[model samples]
Target: NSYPGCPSSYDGYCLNGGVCMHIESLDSYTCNCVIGYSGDRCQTRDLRWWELR
Candidate 1:
């Protein structure tokens, strides 16, 4: 279960299919982005994908 004050209080908190990770110890949350995504909230796309094709 997530902490009470965790940032992932709702669905879609992490964009681009990223997973929301709740830290019970810190009462915080993080976004685990997919392979082509990068950023605190997975809001940015890696330029390498565009560069490759």
Candidate 2:
């Protein structure tokens, strides 16, 4: 997170509408993923993982 702002995002971007935030302590970014998604910046996720028909 040394490089503040969205420039140094996870993998350079947050997928599935997830938000990428900088974690200063770790000098990295963490993905605040949206619903129906999960992972390091919403890299991998499944709607069924949380719910199913």
Candidate 3:
């Protein structure tokens, strides 16, 4: 798998039409998004509602 537009590290990690977060570590990589974000590729914008939807 590979992302044609994204960088090498994001290849196969980032979903199609999605964003990617680069987490650098010792000889490894971790793909994720900022806190309060969650989705197939962090594309789903989170709505912080205290009460249930």
Candidate 4:
């Protein structure tokens, strides 16, 4: 019931299924993206480099 360091003020701060993790004492938080996605906000999907060709 207690998610340490996670405050309600940061609710839904991350997008696209990203999880918010508060860095205790740093007064900061980061986004932990789900599989197949990557980015500061998990806004970018993981794609192969060759796909750009």
**Highest-scoring model, TM-score:** 2
Per-model TM-score on C-alpha atoms: 0.48, 0.54, 0.26, 0.46
**Per-model C-alpha lDDT, please?**
0.60, 0.62, 0.44, 0.59
Ranking by TM-score: 2, 1, 4, 3
Ten residues in sequence with the least summed lDDT for candidate 3: 26-35
Best by lDDT: 2
lDDT of 3 by residue, 1-53 (tens): 33323358545554433355434444343343334444545444464442345
- Lowest lDDT block of 10, candidate 2: 1-10
| Cα deviation of 47, candidate 2, in Å | 5.4
Clashing pairs in 1: none
Across 1-53, the per-residue lDDT of candidate 1 in tens digits comes to: 45423343566667887766666656557665666785654777663342233
Residue 7, candidate 2: how far off, in angstroms?
A: 0.8
**Candidate 2 lDDT over residue span 1-53, tens digit each:** 34435674236567878766667876766665666676766766655354348
Better of 3 and 4 by TM-score: 4
lDDT of 1 at 3: 40
Off by over 4 Å in 4: 1-4, 46-53
Q: Give me candidate 3's TM-score against the actual structure.
A: 0.26
lDDT of 4 at 28: 71
In terms of lDDT, which candidate is stronger, 2 or 4? 2
